[PDB]
Every structure is written in structure tokens, then in C-alpha cells.
Coordinates of C-alpha atoms in Angstrom, one line a residue:
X1 CA -70.9 83.6 39.6
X2 CA -72.0 85.2 36.5
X3 CA -69.8 85.4 33.7
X4 CA -67.1 88.4 33.2
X5 CA -68.6 91.5 31.3
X6 CA -66.8 94.2 29.2
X7 CA -67.7 97.5 29.3
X8 CA -66.9 100.7 26.9
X9 CA -66.5 103.5 29.2
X10 CA -67.0 107.0 27.8
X11 CA -64.9 109.9 29.0
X12 CA -63.1 113.3 27.8
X13 CA -59.5 114.0 27.2
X14 CA -58.8 115.3 30.7
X15 CA -60.5 112.7 32.7
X16 CA -58.6 110.0 30.8
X17 CA -55.3 111.3 32.3
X18 CA -57.2 111.0 35.6
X19 CA -58.2 107.4 34.9
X20 CA -54.8 106.6 33.8
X21 CA -52.9 107.9 37.0
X22 CA -55.4 107.1 39.6
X23 CA -57.0 103.7 38.2
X24 CA -60.2 104.6 39.1
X25 CA -63.5 105.0 37.1
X26 CA -66.5 106.9 38.0
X27 CA -70.0 107.6 36.9
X28 CA -72.4 110.3 38.2
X29 CA -75.8 109.6 40.0
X30 CA -77.5 109.4 36.7
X31 CA -75.7 106.5 35.6
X32 CA -75.3 104.7 38.8
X33 CA -77.9 101.9 37.3
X34 CA -75.3 100.9 34.9
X35 CA -72.3 101.2 36.8
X36 CA -74.1 99.1 39.6
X37 CA -74.0 95.9 37.3
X38 CA -70.6 96.0 37.3
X39 CA -68.2 93.3 39.1
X40 CA -64.7 92.3 40.2
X41 CA -63.1 90.7 37.0
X42 CA -64.9 92.5 34.7
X43 CA -62.9 94.7 31.8
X44 CA -63.4 98.4 31.3
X45 CA -62.4 99.8 27.7
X46 CA -61.5 103.4 27.9
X47 CA -63.1 105.6 25.3
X48 CA -61.9 109.0 24.7
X49 CA -64.3 111.1 22.7
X50 CA -63.5 112.8 19.1
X51 CA -62.4 116.6 19.3
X52 CA -64.3 117.9 16.8
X53 CA -63.6 121.4 15.0
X54 CA -60.2 122.8 13.4
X55 CA -57.9 120.8 15.7
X56 CA -59.6 117.8 15.3
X57 CA -58.9 114.6 17.3
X58 CA -60.4 111.2 16.3
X59 CA -62.4 109.1 19.0
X60 CA -59.7 107.0 20.8
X61 CA -59.5 103.7 22.8
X62 CA -57.0 104.7 25.3
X63 CA -56.5 101.5 27.4
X64 CA -58.4 98.4 28.9
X65 CA -58.5 98.0 32.8
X66 CA -59.7 95.1 35.3
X67 CA -62.0 96.1 37.6
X68 CA -60.8 95.2 41.1
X69 CA -63.2 96.4 43.6
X70 CA -67.0 96.5 44.0
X71 CA -68.8 99.8 43.2
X72 CA -68.3 102.0 46.2
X73 CA -69.3 105.6 47.0
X74 CA -66.9 108.4 47.5
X75 CA -67.3 112.0 46.6
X76 CA -63.5 113.2 47.1
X77 CA -62.7 115.4 43.8
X78 CA -60.5 113.5 41.4
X79 CA -62.2 114.1 37.8
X80 CA -62.9 117.1 35.9
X81 CA -66.5 118.5 35.8
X82 CA -68.4 120.5 33.4
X83 CA -69.2 124.2 33.9
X84 CA -73.0 123.5 33.3
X85 CA -72.8 120.5 35.9
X86 CA -69.8 122.0 38.3
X87 CA -70.8 120.4 41.4
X88 CA -70.3 116.7 39.7
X89 CA -68.0 114.3 41.5
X90 CA -68.8 111.1 39.6
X91 CA -69.1 109.5 43.1
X92 CA -69.8 105.9 42.1
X93 CA -66.6 104.3 41.4
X94 CA -64.4 101.2 40.9
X95 CA -60.9 100.6 41.7
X96 CA -58.9 99.4 38.7
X97 CA -55.9 97.3 37.8
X98 CA -54.1 98.5 34.3
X99 CA -54.2 95.9 31.6
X100 CA -52.8 97.6 28.6
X101 CA -52.3 101.2 27.7
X102 CA -52.6 101.6 23.8
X103 CA -49.5 103.2 22.1
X104 CA -50.5 104.7 19.6
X105 CA -53.9 105.1 20.9
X106 CA -56.5 103.1 18.8
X107 CA -58.5 105.3 16.3
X108 CA -62.0 104.0 17.0
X109 CA -63.2 104.9 13.6
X110 CA -60.6 102.5 12.3
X111 CA -62.3 99.6 13.9
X112 CA -65.9 100.2 13.3
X113 CA -66.1 97.7 10.1
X114 CA -65.1 94.7 12.5
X115 CA -67.1 95.8 15.9
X116 CA -69.9 93.4 15.9
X117 CA -71.6 95.6 18.5
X118 CA -71.8 98.8 16.0
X119 CA -74.5 97.7 13.8
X120 CA -74.8 100.8 12.3
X121 CA -71.7 101.3 10.5
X122 CA -72.6 104.5 8.9
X123 CA -73.8 106.4 11.6
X124 CA -72.6 105.4 15.2
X125 CA -71.0 108.4 16.6
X126 CA -74.0 110.3 18.4
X127 CA -73.9 108.6 23.5
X128 CA -76.4 109.6 26.0
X129 CA -74.4 106.8 28.1
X130 CA -71.5 106.6 30.3
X131 CA -70.9 103.0 29.8
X132 CA -72.0 100.1 27.1
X133 CA -71.6 96.9 27.7
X134 CA -69.8 95.0 24.6
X135 CA -69.4 91.6 23.7
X136 CA -66.2 89.6 24.5
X137 CA -65.3 89.2 20.6
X138 CA -65.2 93.1 20.3
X139 CA -63.1 93.3 23.6
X140 CA -60.7 90.7 22.1
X141 CA -60.6 92.5 19.0
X142 CA -59.6 96.0 20.6
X143 CA -57.3 94.5 23.5
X144 CA -55.4 92.7 20.9
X145 CA -54.4 95.5 19.1

């Protein structure tokens, strides 16, 4: 079989809490093409987006998980949708096994200089993707924190 892959999964504060509790990662129809590339044994790195504004919160790496199921479809509600796409259920999912929850959480901005997948060290922040593959060496840098 193919080698294990490492996936950065982009989520928000509310859904991180759901992922942490239910140990399930899910994406919307628009991104099923990416999650379908996931397989048992792969690792998911949960990225919690920055909170901009006066109540600033840095972008966080909240934890790492092991994928323990093939991608399945389930529309039972578990995640928090947005007001503009209120009927979103993030039906494409995978079961997870907790590997490590970072305490304190990893401030992603502090890792920028050493992350190989981030080639633009100055402008990286600005997405349009729910999942991003990353190299084993970046996974190691993270999970070893």
C-alpha cells in the first residue's frame, strides 16, 4: 500500500471542541475530493484558525490524530455550520484516534520559520482549502512539540 500521508485540517474554535470530543473529522461536499485521498494510518493535524480583532487569538495547532476508518458518509449533525451555509453537515468523515493534544496549544506563527511546506514565510495566512497535505518532516516538527 501507499505510504502514510499527513494532513493539516483547518477548523474553527467551535468545531475543534467537537473534533476533540467526538474524534471525527469531516468536510463539506466541495472538499470531498481531498478527504477521499485519506486512508487508515494517515495522520491529521488540527489547525484552529486565528481570531482577528481586539480579542486576538493566534492560529493554533490543537492536536494530532490517527485516521482509523475509511471515509464514510454521515449527515447526522455534530459540527457547527456557518450562518451563510446553515444546512452544512460536513457529511464526508473519518473516525480518529487521539495521538496528542497540545497543552499549551502550538502557536502556528512560531513554527513558520521551520515549516518546510510554508515557502512564503512573510505572507502565508490567507485557505480556500479545508485540508492541506504536509511532509513527514513538518509533521515530526509539530507532533514533537
